[PDB]
């Protein structure tokens, strides 16, 4: 997310377009965007097109315009000496697609190769006309869109959704790099600044959870300190753990420690889960998801989150503000946790409502116990307290003495409502977490971990997820193409070291130059047995599953495999919210807004139209009078419900009286005749 933020092209700033005013000619893909701005990975809402992303190979010239590398092709020879062309000069010449079949001899196979002619018109042409060439089939896409495997098999909309989702995956407690990634994951992590790349080659001397100490090849020692369990801008843990031993030798530019979402230096935003593509009893209905309970018991998707609570004691004109332990008009039991200074002892599970920092307000006893407490909907242990004291000549703001701050951390397992999503735009919310017993299990008893509805794939034109599932099965099982008598025809151009792979063999399919369909067919045709000489998944890629709920085998084979899915930062724990009564607004006496200060959901203007259309008059009247801004009405309704008495009658909206006063203030004698 950070790396994509640092490479964003926002067209809306002071001196730039306005979101409300921006039209439809700017919110578009221009043929000059090829290799300079990504035609995918755009905000899905009102910022559709006003916030782009800089492509992978693009760079900015001294003036400010963007340039993209090419590969100067001369006399039909695709020569090196890349030249960074700009858009204007790009128009003049004719660019060639790198996926074009260069025969390693500086000459295309066929004469007709598609090229962006002048004004982004793709056309064929003879090799003499061709002037330049792309660097890679993977140049127009950005850094987060390049991590989608089988991108060319997804439709632009779903690829955009997947690219915008890879930036939302939460760091899981454990990380697992994809079996079927693309390759833009080691560089996307070493160029993001979260993996601690070694400064200079050397030999690790002492490696611990909090410090590596590279003993350089010149007698110098450079200890790398690991930021353990920190808080990111979005409350997500920032674990860094060493991945080297005390005897290893590292090289300059080598990854020496993992980061938040990393596995051996590569981006790992999710986990590899065994997935079935069948509809199942309607629980995975309309984009919902069914998870196995194994993902909850084994912490397969269990993210650590940290919240940052702060409170300060201002000098104020009156003076004497102090963070004291003794809380006026308080109980002893509630004060047990606080330490001598008045700060909770680190390692205590501060549940919602518990005291964190006893603060008194000497309104120069005039001391309100305005103590920082575990806010509404918070929990978890206290992992760190930071207090800055004026007496310690700290750089505090003007007019304070202490700036105590607390961190509460909480491990959130995956539950019903969380928003797992693959890399292809196949987002959904967990509809049910089935127990591991009643799950479709393969012939060998292995229960599938997740079930995805069949009706979501063909409609949305993101078949790339199915290919990812097949190749994930192939990678997990391992394969061995039998070249006993000549290599197979479908594997002639398959690279060596890919004709045989041991189980759990991570592969990569570059974004636009990866695994063809025939190669997937073949690698499914030849896969190793699991433990006994039984192949659980046939050539089609579909297994014969057993319904764990009833026992009978499903009548037809079911597509199974391993798909990489990511836990998005849209957990249900942050969205559930309810109000019976609480804080009310001040000017208009309506309730307050937002989950933070309790707050109440807004009965919008077009939710009054629905009630009026229903003809429900009394419900609308009560909602607008005795629930919102009829103060006497509100209190009497509460008393009526707590007691047994009938619900009272309404009054006058305080909002209407506010409007009357404002209309008078304008200079208009509004009056309510009789």
């Amino acid at each position: 997310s950070g790396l994509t933020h640092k490479r964003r092209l926002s067209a809306l700033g002071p001196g730039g377009l306005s979101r409300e005013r921006a039209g439809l000619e700017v919110r578009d893909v221009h043929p000059s965007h090829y290799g300079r701005m990504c035609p995918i990975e755009t905000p899905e809402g009102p910022n559709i097109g006003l916030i782009g992303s800089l492509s992978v190979y693009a760079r900015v010239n001294p003036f400010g315009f963007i340039e993209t590398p090419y590969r100067k092709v001369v006399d039909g020879v695709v020569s090196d000496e890349i030249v960074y062309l700009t858009a204007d000069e790009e128009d003049r010449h004719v660019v060639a697609q790198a996926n074009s079949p260069i025969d390693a001899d500086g000459r295309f196979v066929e004469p007709r190769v598609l090229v962006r002619r002048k004004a982004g018109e793709v056309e064929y042409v003879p090799s003499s006309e061709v002037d330049y060439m792309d660097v890679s089939p993977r140049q127009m896409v950005s850094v987060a869109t390049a991590m989608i495997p089988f991108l060319e098999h997804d439709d632009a909309n779903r690829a955009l959704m997947g690219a915008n989702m890879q930036r939302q995956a939460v760091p899981l407690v454990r990380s697992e790099a994809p079996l079927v990634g693309t390759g833009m994951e080691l560089r996307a992590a070493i160029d993001a600044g979260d993996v601690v790349v070694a400064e200079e080659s050397g030999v690790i001397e002492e490696v611990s959870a909090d410090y590596i100490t590279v003993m350089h090849d010149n007698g110098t020692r450079r200890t790398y300190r690991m930021r353990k369990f920190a808080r990111s801008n979005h409350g997500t843990c920032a674990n860094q753990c060493p991945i080297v031993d005390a005897g290893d030798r590292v090289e300059a530019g080598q990854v020496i420690a993992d980061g938040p979402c990393t596995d051996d230096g590569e981006m790992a935003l999710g986990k590899n889960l065994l997935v079935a593509i069948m509809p199942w009893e309607g629980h995975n209905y309309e984009d919902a998801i069914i998870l196995s309970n194994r993902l909850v018991e084994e912490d397969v998707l269990t993210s650590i989150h940290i919240e940052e609570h702060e409170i300060d004691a201002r000098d104020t004109k009156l003076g004497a503000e102090e963070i004291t332990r003794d809380i006026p008009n308080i109980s002893d039991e509630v004060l047990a946790d606080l330490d001598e200074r008045g700060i909770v002892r680190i390692g205590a599970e501060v549940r919602d409502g518990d005291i964190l920092v006893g603060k008194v307000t000497p309104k120069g006893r005039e001391v309100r116990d305005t103590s920082l407490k575990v806010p509404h909907g918070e929990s978890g242990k206290v992992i760190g307290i930071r207090v800055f004291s004026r007496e310690d000549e700290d750089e505090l703001p003007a007019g304070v003495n202490e700036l105590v701050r607390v961190y509460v951390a909480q491990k959130r397992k995956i539950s019903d409502g969380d928003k797992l999503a693959g890399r292809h735009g196949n987002k959904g919310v967990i509809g049910k977490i089935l127990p591991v017993e009643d799950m479709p299990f393969l012939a060998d008893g292995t229960p599938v971990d997740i079930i995805l509805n069949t009706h979501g794939v063909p409609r949305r034109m993101n078949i790339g997820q199915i290919l990812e599932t097949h190749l994930g099965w192939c990678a997990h099982s391992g394969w061995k193409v039998d070249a006993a008598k000549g290599v197979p025809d479908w594997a002639a151009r398959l690279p060596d070291e890919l004709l045989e792979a041991q189980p759990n063999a991570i592969v990569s399919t570059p974004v636009f130059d990866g695994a063809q369909e025939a190669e997937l067919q073949g690698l499914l045709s030849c896969t190793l047995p699991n433990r006994d000489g039984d192949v659980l998944v046939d050539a089609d890629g579909k297994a014969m599953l057993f319904d764990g709920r009833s026992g009978e085998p499903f009548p037809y084979p079911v597509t199974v495999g391993y798909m990489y899915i990511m836990k998005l930062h849209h957990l249900v724990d942050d969205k559930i919210h309810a109000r019976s009564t609480g804080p009310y607004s001040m000017i208009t006496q309506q309730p307050l807004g937002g989950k933070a200060q309790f707050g109440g959901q807004r009965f919008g203007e077009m939710e009054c139209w629905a009630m009026q259309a229903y003809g429900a008059a009394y419900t609308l009247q009560e909602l607008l009078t005795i629930k919102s801004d009829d103060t006497v009405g509100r209190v009497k309704v509460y008393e009526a419900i707590v007691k047994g008495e009938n619900i009272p009658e309404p009054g006058i909206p305080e909002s209407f009286k506010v409007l009357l006063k404002e209309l008078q203030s304008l200079c208009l004698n509004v009056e309510v005749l009789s």
Binding site: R71, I190, A192, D264, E266, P495, E497, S508, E519
Partner: peptide, 30 residues
Amino acid sequence: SSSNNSVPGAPNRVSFAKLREPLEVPGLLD
């Protein structure tokens, strides 16, 4: 061939890549 040669501790992640790589991805934060 494989993932890459530029990074020393690159995990052995074999690639289905057919085309070669005339250039390496620049520094992304550059």
